[PDB]
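Help! Submission page says 'invalid entity' but I think these are all valid:
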Amino acid sequence: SIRLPAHLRLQPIYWSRDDVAQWLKWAENEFSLRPIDSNTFEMNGKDLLLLTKEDFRYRSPHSGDVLYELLQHILKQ
Amino acid sequence: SIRLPAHLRLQPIYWSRDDVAQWLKWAENEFSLRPIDSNTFEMNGKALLLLTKEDFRYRSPHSGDRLYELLQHILKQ
Amino acid sequence: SIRLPAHLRLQPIYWSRDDVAQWLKWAENEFSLRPIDSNTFEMNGKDLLLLTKEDFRYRSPHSGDVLYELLQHILKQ
Amino acid sequence: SIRLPAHLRLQPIYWSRDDVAQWLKWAENEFSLRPIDSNTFEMNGKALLLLTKEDFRYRSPHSGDRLYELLQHILKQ
Amino acid sequence: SIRLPAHLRLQPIYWSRDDVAQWLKWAENEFSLRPIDSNTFEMNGKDLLLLTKEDFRYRSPHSGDVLYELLQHILKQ
Amino acid sequence: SIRLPAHLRLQPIYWSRDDVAQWLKWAENEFSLRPIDSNTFEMNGKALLLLTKEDFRYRSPHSGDRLYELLQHILKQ
């Protein structure tokens, strides 16, 4: 399963700068990722959807790709 | 007849970050893979399932493919 | 029919690197395949069993799938 | 009712690599298929019998499927 | 109880380096042992039959004795 | 006779690696044995039955002898 927090139930396109932060915070706990500096993902959803797997790795060499695939799944659903 | 260590013999989604690491050390010896940083995949099982062959290979150029393949086997079994 | 050479007469899980290489050279003769470079399967039976048909084709675009089907056949035995 | 050239009437298991290419040529003519390169089936009959429909289809997208069933007919016969 | 692959059912004394490598894989599987590295036993049956339980212990701290007791039963049987 | 957990109702020869581990815990509660590290017996029942009193004692100087005797009794039941 996946189960996303209440607030993030909406399509990624409408996510606010803060939503994206809650999504990172959530993701960290859910998949037991190493904490990343949220100061690296300052942006809403629209632009986030414009990042390549490579941009994610840049902002987080440890969980970047997991975060990318995660996002890809949330959409594909 | 590929058999996982008994303590890991359950769906990867229930695997903890510790199980993943142990999954790794075991795979190295079980399949004679070029050594890798015991903690190269700091994440739990659910996250592991999100990665792609490409993702595995980036984290481990020499053993990533095989690792991906073992996980795919474990699941498709 | 298809009977393996004497010392390969046991589960591929027990096959060593030298056994795999021996398996290829025997396959070539038994099935009249074009020589395969014994530098493409630098692995043992357990590793051998994680490879997909596509992975076999990757090593050998011409005989790859034959070998893969040979393995499944021997496996079903 | 069809009937193979006298030279190929023995069971596929006993077909040489040369017999396999000859079989493709016979089939290409007898069934009006598009050209079939011998270098697509460099193997003897033992190997041929291991190939699945997809495998034929992979070697010949246009004629693969039909080559497969033609082989099947010879076998059941 | 203890059923060896037909191929390794000859007198241990006759086992080759490869036979021993095979026996180690069979044993790990048959007895749910932790992975055993074959480089710790780069020898044939003639040398294997000379080692003491303490030598197995050394070459393999976690399953050396099981392998020793196993070898004994194979001889007595 | 005694109160063996459900999973250990069968003959030790059929015990799985997990059964062994559970057996050790059961034994330590029943005979107030000093907590032993499961990492000491990574093997299944068939392997357990191949161990001698010295082998048991080797893995557990403190409770080895008692575990061996206890198994002989369960075995004799």
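Support: the input was valid. A stray whitespace character was the problem, and the output above is from the cleaned input. Chains D and B do not touch (no CB pair under 8 Å).
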